[PDB]
Paper text:
S-layer proteins (SLPs) are self-assembling, crystalline proteins coating the cell surfaces of many prokaryotes. We determined the atomic resolution structures of all functional domains (I-III from N- to C-termini) present in the three S-layer proteins SlpA_ac, SlpX_ac, and SlpA_amy. The Lactobacillus S-layers are anchored to the cell wall through interaction with teichoic acids (TA), either lipoteichoic acid (LTA) or wall teichoic acid (WTA).
The arrangement and architecture of SlpA_ac and SlpA_amy are highly similar. The N-terminal part, exhibiting the first two domains (SlpA_I and SlpA_II), is known to be responsible for the self-assembly of the S-layer protein into a regular lattice. The crystal structures of SlpA from L. acidophilus and L. amylovorus and observed crystal contacts reveal the self-assembly formation. The self-assembly region (SA) is formed by domains SlpA_I and SlpA_II, building a 2D crystalline network that forms the exposed surface of the SlpA layer.
Residue numbers in the entry:
A (entry chain A), B (entry chain A): 213 to 260, 265 to 309, 314 to 326
Amino acid sequence: SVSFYEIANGNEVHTGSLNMTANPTSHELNVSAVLAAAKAKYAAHQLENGASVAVTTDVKDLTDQLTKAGIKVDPLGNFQAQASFSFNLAAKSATATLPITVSVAN
Amino acid sequence: SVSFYEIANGNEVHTGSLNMTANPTSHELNVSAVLAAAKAKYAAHQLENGASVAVTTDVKDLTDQLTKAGIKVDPLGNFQAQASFSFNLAAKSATATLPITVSVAN
């Protein structure tokens, strides 16, 4: 009964996607900018009586997801970007996940 | 210089996908069957002199990825399935990741 939607237009989604640019000199991304891009684009709710549902994923959850995928993240949150990688957003009222695939211009 | 390909036809890929069916009574999936489905479909290599590259993700890596996405996995590897979720396969010669989105018939 928890579903995700695109903020800009209100359409329900069951997968997500992001286009990002890495730093032009170091070719790095920061974990906190990936999470903020995701939460600027997607949100969650419960349908009717209907209400917003909190997205529980925080910056250390995302750091741990990436670390277990073989990606190395330094103490500042920076990591060398891949052309393609993914992570899950979680929401809890009833739990639900939104898989997000990221493409990086590098 | 590491790339992934579909085993059945040899086409290079930069994202992956899987269709799975959960257990008809419990609605559960096991982590080890998800990983075996992924490795039956996708592999990695380095292009020329060319050679196969090992996929390093094992069953405890995948368990830790899912746990950090809010999904609960019991000591036997079983978890209640979502309609949509994702994980990353890693390969190391030069590192590379393949994001895989799973859809579940439930």
